[PDB]
Paper text:
Here we characterize a set of compact CRISPR-Cas12m (subtype V-M) effector proteins and show that they provide protection against bacteriophages and plasmids through the targeted DNA binding rather than DNA cleavage. Biochemical assays suggest that Cas12m effectors can act as roadblocks inhibiting DNA transcription and/or replication, thereby triggering interference against invaders. Sequence analysis of enriched RNAs derived from regions adjacent to the CRISPR array did not reveal complementarity to the repeat sequences, ruling out the presence of the trans-activating RNAs (tracrRNAs) and indicating that Cas12m proteins are guided to the DNA target by a single short (50–60 nt) crRNA. Here we show that DNA-binding activity without cleavage is a common feature of the Cas12m effectors, thereby expanding our understanding of the functionally diverse type V Cas12 protein family.
To better understand the molecular mechanism of DNA silencing by Cas12m effectors, we have determined the structure of GoCas12m bound to crRNA and target DNA using cryogenic-electron microscopy (cryo-EM). The 2.93 Å structure of GoCas12m-crRNA-DNA ternary complex revealed that GoCas12m protein adopts a bi-lobed structure, characteristic to other Cas12/TnpB proteins, consisting of the N-terminal recognition (Rec) and C-terminal nuclease (Nuc) lobes. The Rec lobe contains wedge (WED) and REC domains, while the Nuc lobe includes a RuvC-like domain with an unusual H322-D497-D590 triad at the active site and a Zinc finger (ZnF) domain. In comparison to TnpB, which comprises the minimal functional core of the Cas12 nuclease family, Cas12m has acquired a long ɑ-helical insertion (termed ‘Roof’) in the REC domain (residues 50–124), a larger ɑ-helical subdomain between the ꞵ11- and ꞵ12-strands of the RuvC domain, and several insertions in the WED domain. The ∼30 nt CRISPR repeat-derived GoCas12m crRNA fragment folds into a compact structure consisting of a triplex region and a pseudoknot (PK), which is anchored to GoCas12m WED and RuvC domains by hydrogen bond (H-bond) and van der Waals (vdW) contacts. The 5′-TTN-3′ PAM-containing region of the target dsDNA is accommodated between the REC and WED domains. All four bases of the 5′-TT-3′ dinucleotide are read out through base-specific H-bond and vdW contacts. Separation of the target (TS) and non-target (NTS) DNA strands immediately downstream of the PAM is facilitated by the REC domain residues Y134 and N156 that insert between the two strands and stabilize the last unseparated DNA base pair. The guide RNA-TS DNA heteroduplex is enclosed between the Nuc and Rec lobes and is stabilized by multiple interactions between the phosphodiester backbone and residues from the WED and RuvC domains, similar to the smaller TnpB enzyme.
Numbering used by the authors: 1 to 604
RNA sequence: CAACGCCAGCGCGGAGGCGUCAAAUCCGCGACAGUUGACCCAACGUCGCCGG
DNA sequence: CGGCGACGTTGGGTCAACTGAAATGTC
DNA sequence: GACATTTCTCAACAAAA
């Protein structure tokens, strides 16, 4: 009942998404954008109420002056970086910018302290602004739900997700980091929701109750076919394939009657099921998420449920997994592991999980070299796509300047040689090619033929690139989850450090390395995705109730476990092995990190 | 011709098809907790500065 | 040609909050 | 009255540009 899971079923690809589903997705999108605009108009009001007090106004003026000076100096140092191919300008502007940034930071802290001091005096005004936002959200509910064909479950899902997002943005900006809500362009993707409410004195929302299409207490919302997993797992793969092809009925939301009223509307999505929830689970909700890859729009419906815990374990080795992104002969070495007891690696994972020695107590995890090649092919083909888009932009501009401006078929802004010359995305060229293939403009036959030829070629290349790279990335994640499943299956405890890979990626610009080498390293880290491997290991260990421990990452790479000495940062950590200063031994950083990891785990 | 992508969730492997205004599904194995937003990075195209 | 940077578009990698039900007003 | 929908809200403090 603590442990939440999500059972995902994959909607049939031949399913033509009904107009109701797309209208609901668009309503959810528009609602999110309206909430974003409400947040912008709330931040403006709160900034104004802060600026009302004169002390904060003076501090903000000082901050603005320092901002202007710092912007000038930063432009200067960027110019110097361009002039001196060094990434470290060596100009007086560098020290000037450092001092100006420190003074600006102190000014911002002074303003923040003044705000904190004056907060209690402005408590009523802040409360009123918050009340205005909340009442605007209630009116948004009435606009979209009471009168607006958006199912209240989708509205509540979007509003709860947005409120969580604004809470996390406020928390991020409490720590002093850039964080602000952004808009997104409608893409045909999104999610709709159904909340199954269980009041007091109601039966548990078990899969058998939900599957009961005739008398189930939640027929009006959701109907998910269900086989008992005891029966389900026994049968063949083909039998499960055929028996999982079932329709799920969701409550999509209202539709507008010609008389001006609403009529409830359900969708019957034909989904392929592969796995069933436990008969003890409480089905909390359901979501139909529409995602896009290439030109293709796919859909998956996930039934969220709460499962009881099956009891912790205490029989197995302790395993320490230390993350990395070192290139190697066989592939990126994502992580190195070491165990207190020897491990028998399954033959299917022989390449992926490698052991250094016959003791088999220490080894590494290797992303295959083929995944890297299959991801690099995407860049190879995006080169062709963008060259082709540039060529068709040239042709369109040439034809337009020969034959003058052409009226838009139905677009508000007429297409002209200038606007086409300023078009960037291939979306616009595809849209024009579609609009013109049917109804070419005056003397537009040749240009429409070329436009459609380009759009055919580009769509083919787009599908191939996006699908190839997506399949390669999901193969990588499949390998990550195979490794995580193995470890959570054998391990009695799993040791992971709390090393924020997000910070590692962000601060890589200060690497004192050539930016090309920084970009090679960051591309490798992205392709191997160590943070995904660690998250998978932690998740698999949590599901199987295998205990996990987190050790501080401070000193893991520098400190030599045998030496006990923290080597300096310029000890050639990029290459291996690294020479310890304390004893002059060429120790390996990965093995030492794992050893200190196990030590710090046991000490805790 | 191949390669690449698609063909009842996802990945790997095999058979048979389709070439995007398309098609067609079938079989074995493994894993599977997902939605959101924020941030960062990368790729690609065009360009600028400096240097060989 | 390579080092440094701008612009724009497109998409992925990391980290984390969350996964509810009482009250109310209909048919 | 059994069922579907409305409702509830705790809060500031962001960076390069």
């Amino acid at each position: 009942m603590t442990r939440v899971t999500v059972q995902t079923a994959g909607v049939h690809y031949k399913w033509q998404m009904p107009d109701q589903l797309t209208q609901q997705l668009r309503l959810a999108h528009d609602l999110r954008e309206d909430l974003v605009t409400l947040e912008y108009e709330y931040e403006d009001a709160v900034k104004a109420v802060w600026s009302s007090y004169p002390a904060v106004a003076a501090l903000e003026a000082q901050v603005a002056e320092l901002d202007e000076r710092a912007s000038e100096l930063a432009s200067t140092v960027k110019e110097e970086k361009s002039r001196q191919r060094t990434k470290r300008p060596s100009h007086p502007a560098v020290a000037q910018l450092a001092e100006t940034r420190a003074q600006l930071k102190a000014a911002k802290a002074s303003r923040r302290e003044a705000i904190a001091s004056v907060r209690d005096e402005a408590t009523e005004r802040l409360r009123t602004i918050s009340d205005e936002r909340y009442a605007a959200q209630k009116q948004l509910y009435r606009d979209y739900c009471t009168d607006g064909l958006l199912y209240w479950a989708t509205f509540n899902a979007v509003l709860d997700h947005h409120k969580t997002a604004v809470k996390r943005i406020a928390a991020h900006r409490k720590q002093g980091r850039a964080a602000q809500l952004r808009h997104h362009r409608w893409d045909g993707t999104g999610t709709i929701s159904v909340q199954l409410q269980r009041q007091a004195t109601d039966p548990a929302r078990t899969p058998a109750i939900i599957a009961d299409a005739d008398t189930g207490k939640w027929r009006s919302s959701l109907i998910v076919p269900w086989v008992n997993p005891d029966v389900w797992d026994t049968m063949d793969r083909a039998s499960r394939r055929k028996a999982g092809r079932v329709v799920i009925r969701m409550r999509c939301g209202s539709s507008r009657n010609p008389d001006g009223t609403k009529t409830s509307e359900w969708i019957d999505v034909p989904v392929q099921q592969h796995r069933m929830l436990p008969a003890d689970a409480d089905i909390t909700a359901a979501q139909l998420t529409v995602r896009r890859e290439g030109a293709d729009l796919r859909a998956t419906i996930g039934i969220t449920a709460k499962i009881p815990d099956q009891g912790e374990v205490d029989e197995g080795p302790t395993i320490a997994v230390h993350l990395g992104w070192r290139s190697s002969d066989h592939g990126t070495v994502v992580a190195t592991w070491r165990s207190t007891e020897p491990l028998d690696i399954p033959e299917t994972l022989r390449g992926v999980i490698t052991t250094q020695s016959a003791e088999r107590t220490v080894g590494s995890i290797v992303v295959p070299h083929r995944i890297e090649q299959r991801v690099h092919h995407h860049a190879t083909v995006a080169s062709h796509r963008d060259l082709a888009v540039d060529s068709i932009r040239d042709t369109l501009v040439a034809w337009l300047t020969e034959h003058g401006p052409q009226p838009h078929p139905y677009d508000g802004d007429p297409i002209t040689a200038a606007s086409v010359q300023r078009w960037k995305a291939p979306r616009r060229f595809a849209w024009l090619a579609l609009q013109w293939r049917d109804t070419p403009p005056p003397e537009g036959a040749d240009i429409a033929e070329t436009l459609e030829a380009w759009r055919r070629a580009d769509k083919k290349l787009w599908l191939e690139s996006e699908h190839g790279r997506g399949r390669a990335l999901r193969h990588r994640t499949d390998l990550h989850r195979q490794v995580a499943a193995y470890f959570a299956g054998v391990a009695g405890r799993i040791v992971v450090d709390d090393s924020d890979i997000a910070q590692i990626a962000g601060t890589a610009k200060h690497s004192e390395l050539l930016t090309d080498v920084d970009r090679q390293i960051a591309r490798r880290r992205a392709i191997a995705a160590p943070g995904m491997l660690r998250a998978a290991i932690v998740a698999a260990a949590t599901r199987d109730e295998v205990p996990t421990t987190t050790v501080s990452h401070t000193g893991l790479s520098r400190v030599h476990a045998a030496c006990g000495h923290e080597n300096p940062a310029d000890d050639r950590y990029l290459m291996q092995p690294v020479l310890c200063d304390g004893c002059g031994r060429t120790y390996d950083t990965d093995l030492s990190a794992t050893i200190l990891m196990l030590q710090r785990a046991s000490a805790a």
